[PDB]
Amino acid sequence: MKVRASVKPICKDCKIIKRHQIVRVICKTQKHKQRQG
Amino acid sequence: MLQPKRTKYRKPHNVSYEGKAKGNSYVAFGEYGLVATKGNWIDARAIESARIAISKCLGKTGKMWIRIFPHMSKTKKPLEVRMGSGKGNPEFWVAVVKQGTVMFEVANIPESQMIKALTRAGHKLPVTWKILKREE
Amino acid sequence: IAKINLLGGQAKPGPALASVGINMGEFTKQFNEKTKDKQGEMIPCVITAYNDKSFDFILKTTPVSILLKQAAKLEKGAKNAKTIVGKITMAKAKEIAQYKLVDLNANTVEAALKMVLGTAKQMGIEVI
Amino acid sequence: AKKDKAQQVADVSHLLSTSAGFVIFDYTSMSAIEATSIRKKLFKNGSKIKVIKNNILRRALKAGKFEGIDETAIKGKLAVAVGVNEIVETLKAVDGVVKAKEAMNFVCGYFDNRAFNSADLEKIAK
Amino acid sequence: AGYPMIDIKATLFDGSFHEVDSSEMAFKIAASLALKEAGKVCSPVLLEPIMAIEVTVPEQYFGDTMGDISSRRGLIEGTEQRDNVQVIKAKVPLKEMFGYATDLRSFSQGRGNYVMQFSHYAETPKSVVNEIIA
RNA sequence: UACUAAGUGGAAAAGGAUGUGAAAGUGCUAAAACAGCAAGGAUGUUGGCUUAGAAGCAGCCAUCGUUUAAAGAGUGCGUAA
RNA sequence: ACCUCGAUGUCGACUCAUCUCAUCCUCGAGCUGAAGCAGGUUCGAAGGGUUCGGCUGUUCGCCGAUUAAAGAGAUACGUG
Domain residue extents for chain C: 2-59, 66-127
- Report DSSP state, residue B127: S
* Method in brief: cryo-EM
Range of the domain at D23: 1-125
Report the alpha-carbon distance of residue B127 to residue B104 in Å, rounded: 13
| Residue E88 phi, psi dihedral angles, 5° rounding | -85, 135
Candidates D40, D47, D49: best to mutate against C (most CBs of C within 10 A) is D40
Instruction: Please state at what angle helix D88-100 crosses helix D32-42, rounded to 10 degrees.
Output: 140
| C83 inside 8 A of chain D by CB | no
Say how many CA atoms lie within 13 Å of E34 toward its Cβ.
Answer: 7
Query: Are the C-beta atoms of residues B103 and B125 closer than 8 Å to each other?
Result: yes
* Nearest CA among D86, D83, D104 for reference residue D22: D83
How far apart are alpha carbons A27 and A35 in whole angstroms?
A: 12
Quote the CA–CA distance of E112 and D13 in Å, as a whole number: 71
Question: What does the alpha-carbon distance between residue A27 and residue A20 come to, in Å, rounded to a whole number?
Answer: 19
Which SS3 state, helix, strand or coil, does residue C46 take?
strand
* E52 contacts E91 by C-beta, under 8 angstroms: yes
User: How far: E100 CA to G35 C1' (Å)?
Assistant: 19
CATH, domain range C66-127: 1.10.10.250
Tell me whether residues C106 and D40 touch, CB distance under 8 A. yes
Q: Name residues whose C-beta falls within 8 Å of residue D104's C-beta, 6 or more positions apart in sequence.
A: D25, D26, D27, D97, D98
Question: Measured between alpha carbons, how far is C122 from C61 in angstroms, rounded to an integer?
Answer: 23
Residue of D nearest to C101 (CA): D40
**DSSP type of residue D71:** G
Bases of strand F lying below 7 A from some protein CB: 6, 13-19, 28-29, 31-32, 38-54, 58-71, 73, 75-76, 79-81
Contacts for E73-76 with beta carbons within 8 Å, 24 or more apart?
E73/E125
- Euclidean distance between CA atoms C67 and C65, whole angstroms: 5
Span CA (D26) to C1' (F40), Å: 13
Query: Is B36 in contact with B83 (CB distance < 8 Å)?
Result: no
How far, in Å, CA of E75 to CA of E51, rounded?
12
Contact yes or no for C105 and D43 at CB 8 A = no
Query: What kind of fold does domain C2-59 have according to CATH?
Result: Ribosomal protein L11, N-terminal domain (3.30.1550)
- Spell out where B1-136 has E strands: 32-36, 40-43, 63-66, 72-75, 90-97, 101-107, 129-133
Alpha helices in chain E (DSSP H): 24-42, 62-71, 97-107, 126-129
Is E81 close to C12, i.e. CB distance below 8 A? yes
User: How many other C-beta atoms can be found within 10 angstroms of the C-beta atom of residue B18?
Assistant: 9
Asked whether the beta carbons of E68 and E114 are under 8 A apart, the reply is: no
Separation of C3 CA and F37 C1' (Å) = 30
Q: How many CB atoms lie within 10 A of CB B10?
A: 10
Among candidate residues D36, A26, B133, D126, the one with its CA nearest the CA of residue C108 = D36
Query: In whole angstroms, what is the distance from residue C40 CA to residue C38 CA?
Result: 6
B95, B100, B102, B107 alpha-carbon torsion, rounded to 10°: 180
Q: Phi first, then psi: what are they for C37, rounded to 5°?
A: -60, -40
Task: Give nearest nucleotide to B82 (CA–C1').
Answer: G1
Domain count, chain D: 1
Distances (CA, A) of E56 to B38, D24, D108, E84: 71, 59, 63, 11
- The distance (Å) linking the CA of B80 with the C1' of G62 is 31
Q: Evaluate the CA torsion angle C112, C118, C119, C125 in order and state its sign.
A: positive
Sign for the CA dihedral angle at E118, E123, E126, E130 comes to: positive
Interior CA angle at C116 toward C113 and C120, to 5°? Answer: 135
C19, closest nucleotide (Cα–C1'): F79
Q: What is the DSSP letter of B24?
A: -
